Coordinates of N, CA, C and O in Angstrom, one line a residue:
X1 N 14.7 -25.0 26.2 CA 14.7 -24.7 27.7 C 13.3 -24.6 28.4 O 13.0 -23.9 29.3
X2 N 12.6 -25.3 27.9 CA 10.9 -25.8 28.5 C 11.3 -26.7 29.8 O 12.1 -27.5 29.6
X3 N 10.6 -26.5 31.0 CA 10.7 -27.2 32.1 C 9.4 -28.6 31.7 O 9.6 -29.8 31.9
X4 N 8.4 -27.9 31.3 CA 6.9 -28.5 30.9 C 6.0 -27.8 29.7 O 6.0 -26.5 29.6
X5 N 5.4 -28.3 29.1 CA 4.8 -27.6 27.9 C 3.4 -28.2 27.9 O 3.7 -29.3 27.5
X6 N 2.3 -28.1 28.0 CA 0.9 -28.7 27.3 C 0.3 -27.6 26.8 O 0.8 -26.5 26.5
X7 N -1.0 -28.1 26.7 CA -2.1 -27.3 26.1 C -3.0 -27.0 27.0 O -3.1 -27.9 27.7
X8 N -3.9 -25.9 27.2 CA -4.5 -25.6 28.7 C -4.9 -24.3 28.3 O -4.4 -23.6 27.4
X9 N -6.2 -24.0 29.4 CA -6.9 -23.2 29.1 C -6.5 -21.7 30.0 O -6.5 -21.9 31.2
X10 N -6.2 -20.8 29.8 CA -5.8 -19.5 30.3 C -6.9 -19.1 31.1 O -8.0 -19.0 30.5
X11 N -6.7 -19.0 32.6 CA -8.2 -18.1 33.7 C -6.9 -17.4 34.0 O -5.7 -17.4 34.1
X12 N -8.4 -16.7 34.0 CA -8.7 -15.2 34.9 C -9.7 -14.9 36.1 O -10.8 -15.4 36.0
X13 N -9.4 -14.1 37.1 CA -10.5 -14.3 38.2 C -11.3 -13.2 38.4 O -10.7 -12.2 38.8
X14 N -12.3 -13.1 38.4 CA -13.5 -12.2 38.3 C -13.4 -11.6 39.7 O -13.8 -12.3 40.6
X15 N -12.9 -10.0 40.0 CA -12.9 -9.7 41.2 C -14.3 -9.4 42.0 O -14.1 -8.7 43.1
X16 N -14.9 -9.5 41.8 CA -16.5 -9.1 42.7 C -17.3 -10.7 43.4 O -17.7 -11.0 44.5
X17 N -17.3 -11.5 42.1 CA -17.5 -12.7 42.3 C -16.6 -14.1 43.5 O -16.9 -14.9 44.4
X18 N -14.9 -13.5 42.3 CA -14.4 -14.9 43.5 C -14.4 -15.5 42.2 O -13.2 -15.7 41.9
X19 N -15.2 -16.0 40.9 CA -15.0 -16.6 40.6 C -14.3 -16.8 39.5 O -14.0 -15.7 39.1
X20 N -13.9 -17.9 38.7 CA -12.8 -17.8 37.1 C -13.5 -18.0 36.7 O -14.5 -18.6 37.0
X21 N -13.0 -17.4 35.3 CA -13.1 -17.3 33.9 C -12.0 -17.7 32.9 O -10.8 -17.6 33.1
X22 N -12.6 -18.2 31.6 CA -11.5 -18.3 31.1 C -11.4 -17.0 30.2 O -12.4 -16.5 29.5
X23 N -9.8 -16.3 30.4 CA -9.5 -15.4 29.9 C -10.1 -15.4 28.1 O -10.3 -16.4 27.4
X24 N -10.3 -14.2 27.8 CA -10.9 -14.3 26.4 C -11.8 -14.9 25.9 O -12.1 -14.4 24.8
X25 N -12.4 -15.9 26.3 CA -13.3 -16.7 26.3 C -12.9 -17.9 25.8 O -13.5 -18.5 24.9
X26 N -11.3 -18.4 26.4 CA -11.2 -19.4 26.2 C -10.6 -20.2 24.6 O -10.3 -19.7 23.6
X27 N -10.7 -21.2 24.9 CA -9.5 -21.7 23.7 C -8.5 -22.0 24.1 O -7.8 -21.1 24.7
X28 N -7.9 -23.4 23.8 CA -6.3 -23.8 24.0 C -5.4 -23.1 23.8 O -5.4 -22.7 22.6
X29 N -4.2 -22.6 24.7 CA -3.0 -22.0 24.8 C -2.0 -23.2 24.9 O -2.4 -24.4 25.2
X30 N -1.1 -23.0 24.6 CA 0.3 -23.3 24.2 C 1.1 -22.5 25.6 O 1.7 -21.4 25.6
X31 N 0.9 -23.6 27.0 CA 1.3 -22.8 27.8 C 3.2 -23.7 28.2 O 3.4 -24.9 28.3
X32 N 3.9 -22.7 28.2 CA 5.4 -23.2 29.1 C 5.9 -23.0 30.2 O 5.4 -22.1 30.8
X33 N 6.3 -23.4 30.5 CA 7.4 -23.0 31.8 C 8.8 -22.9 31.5 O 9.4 -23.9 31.0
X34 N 9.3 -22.1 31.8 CA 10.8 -21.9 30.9 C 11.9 -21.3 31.4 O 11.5 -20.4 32.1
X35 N 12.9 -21.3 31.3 CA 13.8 -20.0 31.6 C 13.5 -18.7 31.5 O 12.6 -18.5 30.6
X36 N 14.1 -17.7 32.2 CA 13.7 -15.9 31.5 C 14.7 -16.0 30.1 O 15.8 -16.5 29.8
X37 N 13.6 -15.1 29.3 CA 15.3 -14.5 28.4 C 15.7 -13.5 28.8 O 15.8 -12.5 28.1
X38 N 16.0 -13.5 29.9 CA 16.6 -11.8 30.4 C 17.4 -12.2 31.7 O 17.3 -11.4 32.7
X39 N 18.3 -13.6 32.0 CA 19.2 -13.8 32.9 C 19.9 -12.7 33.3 O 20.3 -12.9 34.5
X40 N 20.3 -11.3 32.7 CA 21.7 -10.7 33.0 C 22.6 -11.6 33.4 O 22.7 -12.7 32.8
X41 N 23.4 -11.1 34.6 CA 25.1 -12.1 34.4 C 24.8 -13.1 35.4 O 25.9 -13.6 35.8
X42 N 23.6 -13.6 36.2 CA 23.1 -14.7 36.6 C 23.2 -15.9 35.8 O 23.4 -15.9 34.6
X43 N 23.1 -17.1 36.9 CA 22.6 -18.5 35.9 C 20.8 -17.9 35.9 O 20.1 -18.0 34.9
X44 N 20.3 -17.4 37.0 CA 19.1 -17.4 36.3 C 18.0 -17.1 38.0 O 17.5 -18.0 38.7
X45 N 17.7 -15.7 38.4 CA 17.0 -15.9 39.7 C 15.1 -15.6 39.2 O 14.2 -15.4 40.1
X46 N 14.8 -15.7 38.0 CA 13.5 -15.7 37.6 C 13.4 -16.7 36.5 O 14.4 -17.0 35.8
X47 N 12.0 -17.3 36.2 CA 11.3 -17.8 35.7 C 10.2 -17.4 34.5 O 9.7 -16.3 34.6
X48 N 9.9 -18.1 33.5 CA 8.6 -17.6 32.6 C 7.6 -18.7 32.8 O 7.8 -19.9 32.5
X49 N 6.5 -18.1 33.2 CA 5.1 -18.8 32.7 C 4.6 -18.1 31.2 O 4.5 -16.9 30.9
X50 N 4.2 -19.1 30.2 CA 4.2 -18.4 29.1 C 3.0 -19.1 28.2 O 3.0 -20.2 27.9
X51 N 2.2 -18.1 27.9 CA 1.0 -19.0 27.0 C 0.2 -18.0 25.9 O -0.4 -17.0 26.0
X52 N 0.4 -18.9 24.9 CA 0.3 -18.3 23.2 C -1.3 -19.2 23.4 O -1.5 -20.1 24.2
X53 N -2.3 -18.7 22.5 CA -3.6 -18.8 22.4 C -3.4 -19.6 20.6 O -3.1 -19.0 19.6
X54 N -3.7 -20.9 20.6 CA -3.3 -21.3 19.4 C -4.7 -20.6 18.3 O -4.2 -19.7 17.7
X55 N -5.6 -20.7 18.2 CA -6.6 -20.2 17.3 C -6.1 -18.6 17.1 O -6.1 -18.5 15.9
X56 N -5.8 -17.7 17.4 CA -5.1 -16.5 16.9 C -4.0 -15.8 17.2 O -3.7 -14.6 17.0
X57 N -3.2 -16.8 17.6 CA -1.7 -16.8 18.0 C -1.4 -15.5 18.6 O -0.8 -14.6 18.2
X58 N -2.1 -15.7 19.7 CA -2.2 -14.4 20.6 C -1.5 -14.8 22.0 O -2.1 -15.7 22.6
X59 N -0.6 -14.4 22.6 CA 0.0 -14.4 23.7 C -0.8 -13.6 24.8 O -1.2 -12.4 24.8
X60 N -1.1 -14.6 25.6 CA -2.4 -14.3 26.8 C -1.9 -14.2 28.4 O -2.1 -13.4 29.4
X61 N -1.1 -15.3 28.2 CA -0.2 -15.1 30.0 C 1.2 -15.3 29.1 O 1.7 -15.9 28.1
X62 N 1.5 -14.1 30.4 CA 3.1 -13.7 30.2 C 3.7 -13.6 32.2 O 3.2 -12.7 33.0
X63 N 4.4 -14.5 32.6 CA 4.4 -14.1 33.9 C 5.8 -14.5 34.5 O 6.3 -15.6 34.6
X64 N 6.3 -13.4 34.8 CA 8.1 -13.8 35.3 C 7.8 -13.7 37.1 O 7.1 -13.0 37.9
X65 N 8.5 -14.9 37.1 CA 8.1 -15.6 38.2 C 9.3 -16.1 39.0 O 10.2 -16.5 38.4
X66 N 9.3 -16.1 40.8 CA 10.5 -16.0 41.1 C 10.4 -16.9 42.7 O 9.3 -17.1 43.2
X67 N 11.4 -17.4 43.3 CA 11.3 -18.6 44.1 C 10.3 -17.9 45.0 O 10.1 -18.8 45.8
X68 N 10.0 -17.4 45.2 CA 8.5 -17.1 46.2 C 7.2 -17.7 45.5 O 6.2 -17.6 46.2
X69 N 7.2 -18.0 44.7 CA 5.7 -18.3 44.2 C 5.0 -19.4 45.0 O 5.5 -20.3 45.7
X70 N 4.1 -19.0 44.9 CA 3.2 -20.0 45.5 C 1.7 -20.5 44.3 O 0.8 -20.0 43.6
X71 N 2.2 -21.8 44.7 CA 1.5 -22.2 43.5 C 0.4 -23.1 43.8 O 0.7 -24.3 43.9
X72 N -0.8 -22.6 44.1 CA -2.6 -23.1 44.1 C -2.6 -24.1 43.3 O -2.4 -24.1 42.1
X73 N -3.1 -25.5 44.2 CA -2.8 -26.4 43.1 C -5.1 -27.0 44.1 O -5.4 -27.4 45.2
X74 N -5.9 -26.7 43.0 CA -7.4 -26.5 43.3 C -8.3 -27.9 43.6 O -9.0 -28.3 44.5
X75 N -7.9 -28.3 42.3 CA -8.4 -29.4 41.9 C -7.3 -29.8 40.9 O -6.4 -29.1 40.4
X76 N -7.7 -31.5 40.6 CA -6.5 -32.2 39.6 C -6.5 -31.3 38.0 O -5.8 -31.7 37.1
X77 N -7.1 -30.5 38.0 CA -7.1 -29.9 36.4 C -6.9 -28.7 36.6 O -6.5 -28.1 35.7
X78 N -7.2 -27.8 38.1 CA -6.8 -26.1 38.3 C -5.8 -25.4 38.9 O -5.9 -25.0 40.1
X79 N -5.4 -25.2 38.5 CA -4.1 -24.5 39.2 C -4.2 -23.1 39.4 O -5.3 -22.7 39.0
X80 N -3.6 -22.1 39.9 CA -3.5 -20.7 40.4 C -2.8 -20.2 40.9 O -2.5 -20.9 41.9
X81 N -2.0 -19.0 40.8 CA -1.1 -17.8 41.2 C -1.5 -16.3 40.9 O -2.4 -15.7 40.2
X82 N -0.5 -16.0 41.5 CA -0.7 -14.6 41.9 C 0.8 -13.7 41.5 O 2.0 -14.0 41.8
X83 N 0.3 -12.6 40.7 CA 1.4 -11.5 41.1 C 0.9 -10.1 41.5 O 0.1 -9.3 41.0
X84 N 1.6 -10.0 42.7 CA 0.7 -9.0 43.3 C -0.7 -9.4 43.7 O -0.9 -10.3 44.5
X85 N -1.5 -8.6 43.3 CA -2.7 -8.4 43.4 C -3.6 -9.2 41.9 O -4.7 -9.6 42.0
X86 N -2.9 -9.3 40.9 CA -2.9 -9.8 40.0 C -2.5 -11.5 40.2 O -1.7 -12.1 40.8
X87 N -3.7 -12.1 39.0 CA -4.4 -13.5 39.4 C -4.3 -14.1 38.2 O -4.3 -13.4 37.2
X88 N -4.1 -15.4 38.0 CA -3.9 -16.1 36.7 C -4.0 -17.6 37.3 O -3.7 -18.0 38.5
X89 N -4.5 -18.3 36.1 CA -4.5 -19.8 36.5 C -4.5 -20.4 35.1 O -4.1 -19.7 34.1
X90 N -5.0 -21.7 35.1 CA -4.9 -22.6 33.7 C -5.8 -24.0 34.5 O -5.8 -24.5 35.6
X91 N -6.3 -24.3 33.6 CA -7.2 -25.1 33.4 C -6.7 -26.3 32.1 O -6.7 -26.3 30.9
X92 N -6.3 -27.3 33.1 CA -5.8 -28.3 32.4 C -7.1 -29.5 31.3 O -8.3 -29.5 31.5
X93 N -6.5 -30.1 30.5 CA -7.0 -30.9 29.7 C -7.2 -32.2 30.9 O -8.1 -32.7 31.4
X94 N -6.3 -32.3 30.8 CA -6.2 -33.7 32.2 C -5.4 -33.8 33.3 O -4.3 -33.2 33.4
X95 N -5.9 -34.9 34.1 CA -5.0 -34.5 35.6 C -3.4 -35.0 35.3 O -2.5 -34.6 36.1
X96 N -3.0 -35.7 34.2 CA -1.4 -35.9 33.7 C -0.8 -34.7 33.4 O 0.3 -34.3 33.9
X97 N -1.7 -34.0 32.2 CA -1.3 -32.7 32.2 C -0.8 -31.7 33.2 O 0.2 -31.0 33.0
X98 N -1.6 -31.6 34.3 CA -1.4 -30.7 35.5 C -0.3 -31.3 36.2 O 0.5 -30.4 36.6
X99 N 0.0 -32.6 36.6 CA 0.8 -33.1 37.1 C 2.3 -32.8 36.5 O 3.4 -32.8 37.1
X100 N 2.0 -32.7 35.0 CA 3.6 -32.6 34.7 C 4.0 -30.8 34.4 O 5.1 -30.4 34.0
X101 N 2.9 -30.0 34.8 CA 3.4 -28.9 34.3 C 3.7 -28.0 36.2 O 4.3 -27.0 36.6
X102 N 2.7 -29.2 36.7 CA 3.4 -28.7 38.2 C 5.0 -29.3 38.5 O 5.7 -28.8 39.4
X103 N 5.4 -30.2 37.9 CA 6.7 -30.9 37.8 C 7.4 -29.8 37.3 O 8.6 -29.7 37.7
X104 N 6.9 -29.0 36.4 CA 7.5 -27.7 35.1 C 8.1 -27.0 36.6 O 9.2 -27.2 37.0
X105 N 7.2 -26.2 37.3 CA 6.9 -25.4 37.7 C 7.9 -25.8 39.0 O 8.7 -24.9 39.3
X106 N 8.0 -26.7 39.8 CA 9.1 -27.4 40.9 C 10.2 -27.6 40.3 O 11.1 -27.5 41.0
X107 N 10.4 -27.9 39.0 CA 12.1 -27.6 38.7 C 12.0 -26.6 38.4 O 12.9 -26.2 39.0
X108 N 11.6 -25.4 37.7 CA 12.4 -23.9 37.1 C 12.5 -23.9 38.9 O 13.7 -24.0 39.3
X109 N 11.3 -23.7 40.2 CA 12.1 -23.2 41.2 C 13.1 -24.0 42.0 O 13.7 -23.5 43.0
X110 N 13.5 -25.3 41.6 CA 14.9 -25.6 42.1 C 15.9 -25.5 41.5 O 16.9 -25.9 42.1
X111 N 16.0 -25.1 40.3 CA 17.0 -24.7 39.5 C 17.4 -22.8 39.5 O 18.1 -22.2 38.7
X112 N 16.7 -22.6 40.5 CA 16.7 -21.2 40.3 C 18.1 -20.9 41.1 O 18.3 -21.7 42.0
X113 N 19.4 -19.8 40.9 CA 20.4 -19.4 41.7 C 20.1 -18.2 42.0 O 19.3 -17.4 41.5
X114 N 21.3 -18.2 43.2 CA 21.3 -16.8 43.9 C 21.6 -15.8 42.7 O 22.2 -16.2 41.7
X115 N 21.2 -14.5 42.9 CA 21.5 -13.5 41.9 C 22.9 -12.7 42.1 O 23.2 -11.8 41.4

């Protein structure tokens, strides 16, 4: 139930500056786009952004995500969202990559149903 899957780098945004970072200091994640596992008796009114850090199999972004998102698309390799006040992005390997995980990211929200 992956919408899109690559490899990509987990940001974070430095609040004083404005600018990103990569979370942890970086290293390829294992990022998805996915269904929730927590539908209740819906087909489904949220989404997962989800990304495991492959060098210490550490889960770095975790983001349930719902047809309001708005999704920062920077440059052909940066992407960005928001929850809340809280900020996360990814930093793609290549502009194909980005391209197909913004594809990820346009079907979980047209596949999303009323609750």
């Amino acid at each position: 139930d992956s919408y899109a899957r690559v490899r990509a780098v987990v940001m974070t945004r430095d609040d004083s500056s404005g600018g990103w970072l990569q979370l942890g200091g970086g290293g390829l994640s294992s990022v998805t786009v996915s269904k929730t596992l927590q539908p209740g008796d819906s087909g489904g009114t949220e989404f997962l952004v989800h990304g495991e850090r492959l060098r210490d199999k550490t889960v770095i972004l975790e983001c349930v995500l719902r047809r309001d998102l708005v999704y920062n698309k920077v440059t052909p390799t940066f992407h960005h969202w928001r929850i809340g006040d809280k900020k996360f992005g990814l930093t793609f390997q290549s502009p194909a990559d980005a391209r197909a995980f913004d594809r990820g990211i346009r079907r979980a929200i047209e596949d999303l149903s009323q609750g």
